[PDB]
Subunit: 363 residues, 4 copies
């Protein structure tokens, strides 16, 4: 009979197998995909000129940390330039990543662009020629990709248009990726900017994710062959009201349970500005939340895995080891965190629970 | 938007507790909500006059079955008439149901109506004065409701309009119910009529459910305070190709995992014309399907729980006891099935977890 | 995704012929469809008891005005009760209306109901059994109907949900009407309540009408067989900034030109609280607006045609003539207005300039 | 309350003024924007090598036709390459166009791309860096742009996804253009391929356009600053039923009246494979259609203005004069057609004194 499925069972198996590898138990993602202009600001914060060699050295610094990170890193997201650079031993970075047990990912969006008629809202571009790009990236060692849409909570934002448009472009991106054997990481980041409280973020997150999945369905996206990279549900950066990690965890898990189909292979949280410690603690609380979570809940951190490393390096080659040690430190912390076994202190623990605390209908 | 939550933490807790009671481990729902017109067909099928007394006697037959059904029945759906009838001992049927540990339910839709401009498609009516009806039903013993929408698989159905409209009306229905302390069972039934295959039914079910949940989100429905009543995923009635129960189970569970948020408290399958044994076996296979299932997967059967009871009764007072044994038998069978413990032996349960080496990428 | 003719060519002609008849040059609509509870309030503003006879007498007063109203009134909307009432001469009100060359219309909605999760927003009920009601109304003399949805401008309103839902139910209402030979007047009223300015009302009116027509399209509605009853575009009742009639006319015609397809037979403005004189003057400025207007632009007034009459009557039968004279005054004025030939009289100003605005909140 | 206007009054004025200039009475558009690959097909049909010089000479040939085309061409669409080429006299082609009273247009889409999971349907790419491209084009002489989406009528096409996606990307393209002072020509072309009949094409065209305008509204598009470039409503190429030009005209105008807001400045039909004569005769019948049309109905022809000229040229510079004469004849023909004054094989006549309103409802 008449039938035109988007993928064959062979294409589905390849995508599903890749997605599961990335978020296998205890593993997370290192998001080191900052574009030229963005990494330039990072290097600037430590008085380091933004040359290709310094970008190569910094990326090599993270990608070649010792084997203690192997069990912690299921994947590494790179920016185009880096995907084609090499370590001092002549090995292309994709080979270095793979030799350490990681799956190579490539950021494919081309930045945000303003949505006319909105209060400073944006959508994301990068769809032009994406299919050919994906085909080339695949041949060059990449198995997954990343695309970032940005939404903001404000007076009249996110608006209906911004929500619908961003969800739609994510679906287009995901569709093209899957046609090329690349697992798409869908990143609809809701910024923490503003003074909104926890319930407001949870509400917006629920509305945004519902839109994202309806769009993924309309575009015939194979969910088992994807990963979701959302913001955790937290109060606004300037929210006067304060909250505990357990509340943040409850709000986040609740929002996800109400919008993310169990078919989605994994949820890899962005750190969104949270300190390295805060990001690890919250991820740990999320994994210890009493609710049933049918998908891996791990990390895809940029700042939360590089903050201390960048600083320790200071743009000086003699600080290589010390810098790598800071990164390992966070890779190890978050690996435990995505399993709910993180105790902020040293590395050893004992107990891990929070009995006598129910009633979560306040969410 | 983002103005005034639909439910307080108190209302949420009430709706959630009710929903969970209905689908507690080993429990399912008896769907005896046939309207006067539909019950006439059943009675006529056994040479029995369609009088209010015969309807009462029949419903009494099912509701007063012995204590063996107590742990099997978490809820009972009734038609308006029956909610206000009494057993021979003078006890209102709702009291009879509650005394056996069941939650009382009430059907609130007013039948299907044709959608102009479509190929024989419909939407369902019954929203007028629904809030008032719900407040009254709640007061009179009902804690949940049921609303049925009907869709068909055909050359050009379900159409975009049918999918959209039915999803929207279901959302309106659920919203009104939740404002009145009533748990809404959302029933988007896709008829098994036609010669379409299993893959086609899975496809359509996936599209329908994605639409159903997007609408529930748009209407601010509290998912934890709802239940889903969908068709299992099966080939069309006239489909020549044959499938196994494992294939029906796999297709069904896959469809649900790709569309139903984990927040949904439970899925209560309609039997849709399957024989009593067929409905029990598929339900059992569904619960044995190796994939992760974040919600209760049980029954809300009408024909699958009454077929043999109705036949044995035959409208004859003398067959009351024989008729009840037939109903109890199915009640016990499905109770085991919703736990994946149904074997033709009965209480014994050694044969389980059969096979394992399989591929779900074919779905 | 093919075409399944909702209407035959014969049905289309009937609906189109009716629509054009109602808004023929120089003609408008008398909206006397206030329900028992709404009319009761009008009778209390004149110390008149709300009795069936008083409602009948009042309706007879308007409907039996001298022949001067014949060229002015293309149609009259009635409430259910009045449709089956008779004049002192024994003639059913529909026969009376028809003998004066007017088309009989029937209000069929059942009032607004609250949308949970919104900031005091509503949708409208009345679809249940609407097909049968329309069939009977048709046999009893009615050729068109009216259904009112209510939207409010404020902080966060109209919400995406309120706009979507109200547009969809209007579409359902219109579909059922056309299946029974009744022309549906689609009324998506955006209340004037608030301190918003002209451009804000224009903005919201454009978004609302865009939604209304997309919905009408999705439901396969025959536009030539419909009429639109919108609010004129004006500043909020509490706006400080003042505007001329030319500006109001410009904003109104512009919003309409940007959303209403030329196929729509006519636009019949509701007066929404404006005084009899203001409503006429604005309708006149609208028809004088230089921009191309592909549809008839006339009136369908309730308050703006009854203000002075209800007053002159005072429930005292002796004031029959005086009261009827005030009604004729406004019909003639509006008849000229919808032709762009009205210049104020300056005679009857006892209640023709009074603000007929009414607070809107709660039930 | 800000509404966040996408455009200021001056920006609107500029776009509106440009749109009206292109479709001024008696004027149409020459679509000579064939990309390198497409123009290759045209040149190969006449045994000519596809070199830049040959393309430059051919475009020069059209752009430099004598002054007789001046009153006929309100705008000329160019492909990027041609926008920066010069005539033999050293004048930039844009300068040539403007010196003859024409507005310069630029095609900005980057071709169609397959939509995964559909039956050979596509969407269009080209949004990446479009803002900067539009700013550059504006500075270099262009005042309007063109973007083509392609949909097809088939057993299951256009699908809901195809319609939704194409309408959305058209809205994004239109939004970016208007932000840069460029008038966007929205071209949602429904191919004539297939054996579907006239009513079928009319149905799909109505649905596609309704989707297009809802999307434009959602994206805050200033309609008075746009032009619509749709297919005329005709039977599929393989349709065995025959229709008159009057029938084609009725269906076309009817479809447009039911979906295109009067605010739209103009409708510029694509020829879509029709012969030069057919395209002219149909455009003429459309302009003579008795129904009310609130927008200019003219041409934006590619093949219908070049067929004979391309053939007469044959890649031989010695055929310049002959080639140009064929183009001049077609420009004159369509200029008359967009005024409803075209008569092939007998350019002579004088009538038109009545109007009336009769027609039928078979559309
Ligand atoms: O400025 P660019 O070139 O667009 O790069 C953006 C990129 O860094 C982000 O999308 C991160 O991959 C992701 O959001 C996690 O980052 P954190 O929020 O954990 O730091
Ligand atoms: O004809 P009516 O008055 O509308 O009643 C319909 C009602 O019986 C059904 O909705 C069942 O509750 C449900 O679909 C399970 O039925 P089964 O498919 O298991 O027989
Ligand atoms: O209170 P009910 O029973 O729902 O009746 C409502 C009805 O009067 C209105 O819908 C008018 O037909 C229309 O809005 C024009 O009224 P004006 O705005 O011209 O006064
Ligand atoms: O193949 P490309 O390089 O994408 O170019 C397409 C371009 O020729 C068309 O979009 C015309 O501007 C328009 O559709 C009218 O063409 P006709 O239908 O009148 O021939």
């Amino acid at each position: 009979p008449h039938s035109h499925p988007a993928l064959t069972p062979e294409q589905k198996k390849e995508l599903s197998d890749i997605a599961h590898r990335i978020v296998a138990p205890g593993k997370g993602i290192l998001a080191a995909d900052e574009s030229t202009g963005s990494i330039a600001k990072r290097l600037q914060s430590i008085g380091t000129e933004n040359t290709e060699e310094n970008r190569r050295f910094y990326r090599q610094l993270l990608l070649t940390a010792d084997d203690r990170v192997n069990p912690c890193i299921g994947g590494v997201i790179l920016f185009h330039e880096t995907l084609y650079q090499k370590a001092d031993d002549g090995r292309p970075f994709p080979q270095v990543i793979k030799s350490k047990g990681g799956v190579v990912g490539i950021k494919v969006d081309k930045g945000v662009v303003p949505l006319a008629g909105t209060n400073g809202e944006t959508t994301t571009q990068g769809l032009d020629g994406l299919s050919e790009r994906c085909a080339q990236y695949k041949k060059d060692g990449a198995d997954f990709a990343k695309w970032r849409c940005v939404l903001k909570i404000g007076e009249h934002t996110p608006s209906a248009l911004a929500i619908m448009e961003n969800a739609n472009v994510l679906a287009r991106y995901a569709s093209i990726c899957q046609q090329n054997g690349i697992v798409p990481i869908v990143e609809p980041e809701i910024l923490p900017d503003g003074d909104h409280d926890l319930k407001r973020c949870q509400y917006v997150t629920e509305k945004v994710l519902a839109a994202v999945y309806k769009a993924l369905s309309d575009h015939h996206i194979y969910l088992e062959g994807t990963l979701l990279k959302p913001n955790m549900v937290t109060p606004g950066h300037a929210c006067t009201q304060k909250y505990s990690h357990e509340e943040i965890a409850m709000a986040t898990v609740t929002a996800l349970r109400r919008t993310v189909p169990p078919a989605v292979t994994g949820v890899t949280f962005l750190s969104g500005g949270q300190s390295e410690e805060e990001a690890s603690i919250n991820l740990n609380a999320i994994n210890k939340c009493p609710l049933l979570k049918p998908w891996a809940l791990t990390f895809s951190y940029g700042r939360a895995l590089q903050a201390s490393a960048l600083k320790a390096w200071g743009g000086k080659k003699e600080n290589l080891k010390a810098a790598q040690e800071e990164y390992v430190k966070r890779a190890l912390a978050n690996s435990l965190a995505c399993q709910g076994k993180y105790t902020p202190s040293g590395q050893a623990g004992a107990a891990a629970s929070e009995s006598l605390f129910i009633s979560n209908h306040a969410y």
